[PDB]
Paper text:
In order to study the molecular basis of IDV HEF and its receptor / substrate binding mode we solved the native X-ray crystallography structures of wild type and mutant HEFs both at a resolution of 2.4 Å. Due to the presence of cacodylate buffer in the crystallization conditions, S57 in our IDV HEF structure is covalently modified by the addition of a dimethylarsenic group. The covalent modification of active site serine by arsenic was first reported by Ian Wilson’s group in 2003, when they solved the structure of an acetyl esterase, HerE, and its complex with the inhibitor dimethylarsinic acid, and illustrated the mechanism of the broad scope inhibition of serine hydrolases by As(V)-containing organic compounds. The electron density of the covalent modification of S57 is shown in Fig 9B. In our IDV HEF structure, IDV HEF is proteolytically cleaved into the subunits HEF1 and HEF2. To confirm the proteolytic processing, we isolated IDV HEF crystals and checked for HEF2 band both by SDS-PAGE and western blot with an antibody recognizing the hexa-His tag engineered at the C terminus. Furthermore, N-terminal amino acid sequencing of the HEF2 band revealed that the first five amino acids of HEF2 were IFGID, the same with ICV HEF. The exposed fusion peptide has also been observed previously in the HEF protein of ICV and in the cleavage site of IDV HEF structure. Unambiguous electron density was seen from the ninth residue (F9) of the fusion peptide. Although we cannot observe the first eight residues in the structure, different orientations of F9 in the HEF structure and other known cleaved HA structures helped to confirm that the fusion peptide does not insert into the cavity.
ICV, however, has only one major surface glycoprotein, the hemagglutinin-esterase-fusion (HEF) protein, which possesses all-in-one of receptor binding, receptor destroying and membrane fusion activities. To further evaluate the infectivity and transmissibility of IDV, we expressed and purified the ectodomain of D/OK HEF, and determined that it also uses 9-O-Acetyl-Sia as its receptor by glycan microarray. We also solved the crystal structure of D/OK HEF, both in its native state (resolution of 2.4 Å) and in complex with its receptor analogue (resolution of 3.1 Å), and the structure of the enzymatically inactive HEF (resolution of 2.4 Å) alone and in complex with two receptor analogs respectively (both resolutions of 2.2 Å). Indeed, our results show that IDV HEF is functionally and structurally similar to ICV HEF, but with some distinct characteristics.
Residue numbers in the entry:
A (entry chain B), B (entry chain B), C (entry chain B): 9 to 157
D (entry chain A), E (entry chain A), F (entry chain A): 3 to 193, 197 to 429
Write the structure that this text describes.
Amino acid sequence: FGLLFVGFVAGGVAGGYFWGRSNGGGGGASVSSTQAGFDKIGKDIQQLRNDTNAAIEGFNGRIAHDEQAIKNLAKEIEDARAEALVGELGIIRSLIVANISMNLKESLYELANQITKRGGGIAQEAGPGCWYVDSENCDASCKEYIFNF
Amino acid sequence: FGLLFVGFVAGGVAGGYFWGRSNGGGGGASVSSTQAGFDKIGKDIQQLRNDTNAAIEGFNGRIAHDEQAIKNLAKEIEDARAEALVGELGIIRSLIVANISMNLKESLYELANQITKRGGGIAQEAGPGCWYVDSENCDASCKEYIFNF
Amino acid sequence: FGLLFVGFVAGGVAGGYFWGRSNGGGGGASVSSTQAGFDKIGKDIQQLRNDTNAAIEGFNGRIAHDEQAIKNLAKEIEDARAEALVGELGIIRSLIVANISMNLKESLYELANQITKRGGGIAQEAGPGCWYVDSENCDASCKEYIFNF
Amino acid sequence: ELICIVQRVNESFSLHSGFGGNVYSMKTEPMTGFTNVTKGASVINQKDWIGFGDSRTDLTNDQFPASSDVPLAVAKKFRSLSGASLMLSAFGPPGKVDYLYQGCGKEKVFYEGVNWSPEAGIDCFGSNWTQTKKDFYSRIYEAARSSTCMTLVNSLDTKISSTTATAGTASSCSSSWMKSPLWYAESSVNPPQVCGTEQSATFTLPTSFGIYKCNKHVVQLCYFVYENKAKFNTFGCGDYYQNYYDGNGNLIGGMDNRVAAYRGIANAGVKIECPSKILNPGTYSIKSTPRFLLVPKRSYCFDTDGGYPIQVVQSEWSASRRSDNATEEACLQTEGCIFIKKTTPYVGEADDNHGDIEMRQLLSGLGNNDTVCVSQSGYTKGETPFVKDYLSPPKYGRCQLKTDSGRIPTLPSGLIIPQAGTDS
Amino acid sequence: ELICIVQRVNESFSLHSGFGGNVYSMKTEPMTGFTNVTKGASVINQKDWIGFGDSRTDLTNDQFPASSDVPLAVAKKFRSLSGASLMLSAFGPPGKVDYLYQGCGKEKVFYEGVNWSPEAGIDCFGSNWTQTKKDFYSRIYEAARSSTCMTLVNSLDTKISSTTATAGTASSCSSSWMKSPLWYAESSVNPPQVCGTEQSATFTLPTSFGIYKCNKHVVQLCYFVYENKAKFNTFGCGDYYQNYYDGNGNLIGGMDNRVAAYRGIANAGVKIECPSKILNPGTYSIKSTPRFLLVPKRSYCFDTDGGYPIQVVQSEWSASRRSDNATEEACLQTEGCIFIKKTTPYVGEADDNHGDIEMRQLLSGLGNNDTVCVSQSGYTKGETPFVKDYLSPPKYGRCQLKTDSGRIPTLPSGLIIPQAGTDS
Amino acid sequence: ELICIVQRVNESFSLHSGFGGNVYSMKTEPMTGFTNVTKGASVINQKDWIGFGDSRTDLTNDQFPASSDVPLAVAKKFRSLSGASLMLSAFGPPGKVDYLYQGCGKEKVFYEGVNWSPEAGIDCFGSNWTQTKKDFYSRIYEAARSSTCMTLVNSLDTKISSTTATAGTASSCSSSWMKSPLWYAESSVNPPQVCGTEQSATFTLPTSFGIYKCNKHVVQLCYFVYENKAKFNTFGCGDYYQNYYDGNGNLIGGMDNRVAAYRGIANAGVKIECPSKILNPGTYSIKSTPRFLLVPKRSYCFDTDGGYPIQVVQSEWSASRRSDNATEEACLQTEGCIFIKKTTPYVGEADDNHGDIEMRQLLSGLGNNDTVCVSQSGYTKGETPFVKDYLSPPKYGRCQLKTDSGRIPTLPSGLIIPQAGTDS
Ligand SMILES: *[C@@H]1O[C@H](CO)[C@@H](O[C@@H]2O[C@H](CO)[C@@H](O[C@@H]3O[C@H](CO[C@H]4O[C@H](CO[C@H]5O[C@H](CO)[C@@H](O)[C@H](O)[C@@H]5O)[C@@H](O)[C@H](O[C@H]5O[C@H](CO)[C@@H](O)[C@H](O)[C@@H]5O)[C@@H]4O)[C@@H](O)[C@H](O)[C@@H]3O)[C@H](O)[C@H]2NC(C)=O)[C@H](O)[C@H]1NC(C)=O
Ligand SMILES: *[C@@H]1O[C@H](CO)[C@@H](O[C@@H]2O[C@H](CO)[C@@H](O[C@@H]3O[C@H](CO[C@H]4O[C@H](CO[C@H]5O[C@H](CO)[C@@H](O)[C@H](O)[C@@H]5O)[C@@H](O)[C@H](O[C@H]5O[C@H](CO)[C@@H](O)[C@H](O)[C@@H]5O)[C@@H]4O)[C@@H](O)[C@H](O)[C@@H]3O)[C@H](O)[C@H]2NC(C)=O)[C@H](O)[C@H]1NC(C)=O
Ligand SMILES: *[C@@H]1O[C@H](CO)[C@@H](O[C@@H]2O[C@H](CO)[C@@H](O)[C@H](O)[C@H]2NC(C)=O)[C@H](O)[C@H]1NC(C)=O
Ligand SMILES: *[C@@H]1O[C@H](CO)[C@@H](O[C@@H]2O[C@H](CO)[C@@H](O)[C@H](O)[C@H]2NC(C)=O)[C@H](O)[C@H]1NC(C)=O
Ligand SMILES: *[C@@H]1O[C@H](CO)[C@@H](O[C@@H]2O[C@H](CO)[C@@H](O)[C@H](O)[C@H]2NC(C)=O)[C@H](O)[C@H]1NC(C)=O
Ligand SMILES: *[C@@H]1O[C@H](CO)[C@@H](O[C@@H]2O[C@H](CO)[C@@H](O)[C@H](O)[C@H]2NC(C)=O)[C@H](O)[C@H]1NC(C)=O
Ligand SMILES: *[C@@H]1O[C@H](CO)[C@@H](O[C@@H]2O[C@H](CO)[C@@H](O)[C@H](O)[C@H]2NC(C)=O)[C@H](O)[C@H]1NC(C)=O
Ligand SMILES: *[C@@H]1O[C@H](CO)[C@@H](O[C@@H]2O[C@H](CO)[C@@H](O)[C@H](O)[C@H]2NC(C)=O)[C@H](O)[C@H]1NC(C)=O
């Protein structure tokens, strides 16, 4: 229901970002499209994903010095060190996922903000990624200009 | 003053989430209620708190292998390991608190967003959790419908 | 273009927080000032910076116990421990920078929110830190009152 | 009209900081806590441990299970026989049960010793069997901590040069003698006129015994102890000596009173001492005073493939009999040895000396499938990384650390309010 | 009209959690992975290593490079000569090349041994040169792991008390004798009537040799081995003995059949044994049976400034000749020694025994400038902290850890949707 | 009209990345830094350390505090007496002050030695007291690093077999003799006709001394050194020997010229050597050539309950007197020993040799209540985890790590602008 929410859909049905519209005759019956020209999201996602390399390269570049003269594997010590390293990798992961989440959401706020400023102010925001465009001052070619579908 | 702010109150006075209203005769004198039917916040808080178990279980499940043949406690080494582990627990804590903070705030944004879309668009947002409802198109039974008090 | 965006400027030109205005005769030509009376940002930045001491003091206060009877430096082990500690310091840094980023942005949202509520609701928000003030109900002394320039 | 949700806190609310958001709350709950510690014995891996025991873990005992300190499933993991003990098998004194202890397990549980205590009244010229006992189990525990397996070696290849010397026998030793050491004496040596010829012998510690690799042997390098030269010279000529050599002639053991002072307790008569030594496999040599020769006939075979710290269980009688704490003291002075000790007397279910309630509790952990740490303070499960008090070494596994409860950080609970920005 | 961007996910989308935001995605990619492991030898620091070798790393060989298992640049880092070996220089048998091995490097590569194998047919009364070989390289490797440098000491200061004894010679030893030990024999000792006088000697291990500090010396403390006293007494009177002492008179080596059993193989005749020992610098003393005296004349000098675990390369002939695996077994039983072993026969490019394709592959790492870890499983670059299988010790450097691929966490990829709050 | 706050940056602004938000700034400040390192001695725990000293830490000195290198509060923590030294108490030479050093402290500070230097001109047939000194303090430091406590044992139980031997005296030793070793000589041994009987003796190292547990004893196993047999035979018959044995007859010390070469400096005459050895408690035996017997009469008692690395302070005279650096070299070659050394001459305030300004600065840390690390480079407080240069071992406590300043990350300062999303 507009950028603060993610909804579920059944068997078929494409997942992603769609245009959804509202009332009309009183009461209306809603409607959801089949995805827009949001190529900015596509590009922003690619950039965000590639930006994860910095955090990963730092982790890969970190390997502890060691020296064992012993002739038989100290399996349990070996496994303990791995487990700790994996634990550290776990935290970094959680940080990266959140970092993508937050920056993508901000990129989505930037998308909505540009749309607001193109019907200014015929748009009228109703929370992020939602607008009350009054079908009075704004016909159909108008909304097409404002929301690109 | 509406979801971007947390204010303090004196000796008595309940803390929490309240309804606050504005002007009128010019100039008015403000007014704050005695907490709403925000059971969604109550449920969201419970869910958020229980979701902390994942981060905690991961920490508890991580215990380093060791082997000492020594007969007397190496107290200082012992204490140093604990201190490091506690330091690690400190970081996780800080991450969990922020994670609750941010997701609760987002849950509060979702609460406000639903309210906006129920008086649409008699509401008119003024920052998160604030609205200019014009007491012209909207009497009292109206605002009751929109803000549930 | 208003708090969701940071723009670049050339050789001269001061960086910072400015007032920017829009259309008019159709079509207008935009305009950006030379920084406002945002002393709240100055104070918020100072407070945020000083709040970093808590995270830093915790790190400085953590020094691992050790005991070496050996007469010659174990250089590679020595360097490995440093590298790990530096790696840990790297993560904390990344957390602190984000913590400043996010709390400053929230302080900027609080700045904008106060401005909204001072022209209420002549303001009309258009994303964070942007407003459609209609130069009809609001002359020049009005906008001066609302946006302090 | 302006309508707002309003966020506010009391003096009862305290602020919790986060990286990317703070939280106001009234209550806090600790993030984690301490793991309980259970006294007694246990294992971190049920598929790789071995127990060595006596009647108190012998499932073939007629009074089982009432005579047992462990249930059937644990008993199957012990190599035990009623009446047996490592030391009894080491020497093989007459009429005592002579069990071939052998097995493999990275974790080891030792629960005997009691069947050779003062109560058993074994003499055989022993100077002090309790001292011998302590020294013996010291060497066993020391070698076992670094070994995967252990076996009795019930017969060493031996060879005496003398063609006239015959096998010694004693009234104080049931009118026979130990299985080990072998005692050879020269009838003709009489100090009259006849001094005799220096006695010689070799013995071999093998590189293996059955399926068990031997990298180390615990053996006794015994000798006689005399009060002085004068008392010795009523038996032989010169000074008493019995020296043990490796294949090159390095002195590795024995007693030589040509250079070392006599230390026999006055008017006690002849005594035998039997210190245990850890030796590499090989062929060793002996030179002795003509009259008396002692030759090692058994050992305990160990490998050096590694093990965990061991567990030794207090092995004493009920109050009615005479016990010792030699295995306790052996364990205490040996690295990598963990001692399990009762706090109340041994009171059995089958007899006085079999099937004790406290011991069954202390051994019940042997036992469980979820032990992750074993220590001198007891054993733990893998609940948290923390314990209220230190786990005393020796210890191994996923072992918890001691921290003060005050240092364990908290999380906000109850009614909660987010906060971010400076709010001013 | 209300117009909204709508966010939705499929059954194909799974949820990934973050600290401060979650992500919905359809695909995941692992965050990192395993670093390959290359078999063979290498170094983590090209500016601090030393190789010791023979013709197979000798750039002065007439058939170079076809006779070589390393290219020119690696060869320059070896101290090598065609025909040489550590052991050959240790004893200096007649007509064999006698190279002065010396050098410094924290990482060490040992690639010889083969020039003294059974194929060389050196006799010189040797009891078993293969056994001597294994014992010798054992002591070298042991001392080298803790040392920065190594040098042959080609001449010890020696001094014999006897004024009649002369320098021994043997038909079985090319009608001369080793450079070390020196063999002095007494012509006049005849068991007839004449027993002779006990022979004496000192030898000195120096505190330095050229520019090399000596904290430790590998030397051989040799002696003759006889079948029994009876066979010895056709040469000398009494029992055979040859004992080595420090400056105070502590027995540190030798063979003394006055206390130790004879162990000479029957009807083999006299044999010489030459075990290696690690000794501190100082002046040492010798006492021997009158007829035969043996005196150490060489050593290998080591410091105790530290080193890394060493690399030993299999040194054998092509199938046509008779090899041994003494350096393999020496390496296997010695801490801090890593062994490089071929899996196919030695087949050379110049001759049968020089310039093998597999060995060139195994040694090519010596080689690279980006090796960060060297282990008994091979060497790695610094790609990730992880490997699919363990790196077997010995090992050193920035060494990877084994984790299951399943434990390596993932990141969202493909079409991605953010999520936060409870959305309800 | 659209009115907006506008966010913009210059070429002067650089971008800093965060997990959940980035920051633009013009300036950066480092997040943390290096902790200073102070040369000299100190302690990490004021409630568990002990000092051993002489006049320079003796608060009972008539010239205190001007004669002292430490103030009153530190002096109270020293066990010191004017004129004393560990070595002086070890031997007890005539007329020298004989202080009973004893105490307990996990951290130990040793600040004497100088009262037995060449300046003191003690002879007593000493071969080289400086060498003896170095060897003595080596053994003290070695045993002290693993011990909680230390005490002089001023009298061992001793027993000589000989009934005719009498107590030796020397003109070179003030016409008397050491407290330790005791010198017994046989008047009647004359090489004329009379050789005498081999001398024998026992001495006992106790399991405790007063309140101090003894697990280890530092003792001297002395002997006479002769140029050769010929020079010895003007005093006794045979070869010189003096051998020390444990209770079983294992040779543990001494000098035996029946097997070891004579090494006495030519025409020097008889000399005594006194190497120190660390021995377990027990009763030990002695056999000597008839004429001269030496018997240990003192020791230093140590436990094995653990300690920290020790601190040894340079103990030398002002330039006017003859010093040595034996305690420096003893410290240098001993694990766990940290040496404090002046860089300028000793110039005192009370006399030439007492109350030096540099030494007071170097010792002032003994001193402080906020030292967290002590190392061979000096000591630190707990400011940061980092230092600019390595802290040389030995070291203990909360010790800082060396990192380059470049690797220390920064934080944004000055005018700051947040950034998130892609902004495009
Ligand atoms: C025939 O041989 C017998 C065996 O040799 C001999 O019996 C021995 O006789 C001696 C002298 O009477 C007794 O000596 C006493 O030993 C005790 C016990 O010491 C050991 O344990 C203590 C710690 O005990 C404390 O903690 C335990 C629980 O762990 C409690 O039960 C106890 O009540 C205490 O609170 C420990 O401090 C000792 O450590 C010493 O030894 C080790 C090395 O072995 C060192 O590392 C350490 O630094 C220290 O020196 C020790 O481990 C002791 O507390 C007393 O002070 C006293 O020394 C023996 O107990 C006794 N042993 C046996 C097996 O009976 C017979 O006397 C002899 N017969 C004849 C006629 O000679
Ligand atoms: C009576 O006995 C006296 C004591 O035995 C004896 O005096 C000794 O005589 C010898 C020979 O003249 C001298 O030998 C020299 O020793 C020095 C010092 O070596 C020690 O320190 C060096 C490092 O020194 C460097 O760093 C220090 C600061 O730490 C600086 O002051 C110095 O200027 C240098 O820059 C070290 O390298 C040495 O290490 C060796 O020994 C250790 C083990 O002990 C090994 O681990 C190591 O690998 C190495 O072999 C050593 O610790 C040395 O530098 C010279 O080259 C030379 O060897 C002694 O100094 C001297 N000692 C005393 C106490 O006086 C008398 O000669 C004798 N009298 C008679 C008549 O015989
Ligand atoms: C759920 O939605 C996604 C896309 O929103 C569907 O993924 C597409 O599937 C086809 C065929 O499998 C691919 O060729 C497309 O490239 C996918 N689109 C994207 C954006 O990746 C998916 O099939 C849907 N799943 C279900 C169960 O209906
Ligand atoms: C501040 O506010 C909180 C609630 O907003 C008050 O907490 C309540 O206190 C009563 C009695 O102590 C409890 O029975 C209620 O359950 C509490 N409410 C909640 C939501 O937990 C608190 O008393 C106030 N404190 C002050 C000092 O006035
Ligand atoms: C970019 O902008 C910043 C400020 O927005 C300029 O910084 C100022 O520079 C002067 C002289 O260097 C200082 O005295 C001021 O204190 C600075 N202002 C602030 C807020 O710090 C900077 O000069 C600009 N850079 C360029 C290249 O034009
Ligand atoms: C992240 O930044 C915030 C804001 O600078 C820090 O919040 C401060 O924390 C202290 C103690 O927790 C409070 O007394 C201050 O009042 C807080 N400042 C504000 C403006 O709220 C927070 O501590 C930082 N997070 C961490 C884990 O260091
Ligand atoms: C941060 O908080 C969120 C919200 O409480 C956690 O999100 C939950 O994660 C689990 C498993 O990842 C999901 O099944 C739940 O549905 C999520 N809850 C919600 C409301 O979305 C998140 O896991 C926390 N982050 C971390 C790393 O622990
Ligand atoms: C979190 O995500 C952001 C956005 O993907 C990362 O920001 C990038 O960082 C690099 C170097 O710091 C910049 O050059 C890019 O321009 C940034 N991208 C954007 C879109 O701003 C950030 O580095 C990540 N945080 C961490 C600590 O890795």
